[PDB]
Design a protein around this ligand. Structure first.
Ligand SMILES: NS(=O)(=O)c1c(F)c(F)c2c(c1F)N(CC1CCCCCCC1)CCS2(=O)=O
Ligand SMILES: [Zn+2]
Length: 257
């Protein structure tokens, strides 16, 4: 029953998930002036050359591209991380309008969408164990602005009509997530949470400074998806973002000056 509506949206989630009011919730606004450059932060190591995509799923929240995570095929290392984190899936959040849709904001600026590449710390053995740990996940967040198309996004765009409604999936092999990355891997980082229920406080967030551009047509195709299942009243899948949460007793670090 949680969702993004008037009667079941972010404002309501604390009743079923009291951690919603916790000490390390995400997303947050990234105040670029008060983020501290940390010269000890390492470059991010994104190793996606052996990624094995399997499937794309509409789970009633977003669309989700899932990978084989039963071996170290696509991993994230370095940056603020001390472990080796395996890619399990990516998904997006987006708006009804080009001027909203991101979860994180930058100096209060909202982007049209935000890509989340989810990785789990291999020292915990499975994803289900990892989400129970304060250093279980590392989510790489990438902003999307509307402008020129992103060619490496088009294969995703093109399959969306085959997963229009909740519970639909489609085979999605040989997708290369390197086509979704910007030129720079400069980043901000802070400790936070899942941005959807169950809102677990298990995530090291790494948000890239440089957005990617996508076209107005690419994001318009995201907005054709449905929150509902087939045979139910149509509800367009838009505005599936949680707003910025209190930073509380946290410092956002920058890898760059
Ligand atoms: N936004 S976020 O990056 O913090 C985030 C996340 F970190 C995740 F790990 C997952 C998310 C999710 F958003 N989702 C959304 C799911 C999470 C809970 C299970 C199924 C219900 C829909 C929402 C995809 C599955 S998931 O891979 O478990
Ligand atoms: Zn997300």
């Amino acid at each position: 029953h949680w969702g993004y509506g008037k009667h079941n949206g972010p404002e309501h989630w604390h009743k079923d998930f009291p951690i919603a009011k916790g000490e390390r919730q995400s997303p947050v606004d990234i105040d670029t002036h008060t983020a501290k450059y940390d010269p000890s932060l390492k470059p991010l190591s994104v190793s996606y050359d052996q990624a094995t995509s399997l499937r794309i799923l509409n789970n009633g929240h977003a669309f989700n591209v899932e990978f084989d995570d039963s071996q170290d095929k696509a991993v994230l290392k370095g940056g603020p991380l001390d472990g080796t984190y395996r890619l399990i899936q990516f998904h997006f959040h987006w708006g009804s309008l080009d001027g909203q849709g991101s979860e994180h904001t930058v100096d209060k600026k909202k982007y049209a969408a935000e890509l989340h590449l989810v990785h789990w710390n291999t020292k915990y053995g499975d994803f289900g164990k990892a989400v129970q740990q304060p250093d279980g996940l590392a989510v790489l967040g990438i902003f999307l602005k509307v402008g020129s198309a992103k060619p490496g996004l088009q294969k995703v765009v093109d399959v969306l009509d085959s997963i229009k409604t909740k519970g639909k999936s489609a085979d999605f092999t040989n997708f290369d997530p390197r086509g979704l990355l910007p030129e720079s891997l400069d980043y901000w980082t802070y400790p936070g949470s899942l941005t959807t229920p169950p809102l677990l406080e298990c995530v090291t967030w790494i948000v890239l400074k440089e957005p990617i551009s996508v076209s107005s047509e690419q994001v318009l195709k995201f907005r054709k998806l449905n929150f509902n299942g087939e045979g139910e009243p149509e509800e367009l899948m838009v505005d599936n973002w949680r707003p910025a949460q209190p930073l509380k007793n946290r410092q956002i670090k920058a890898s760059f000056k």
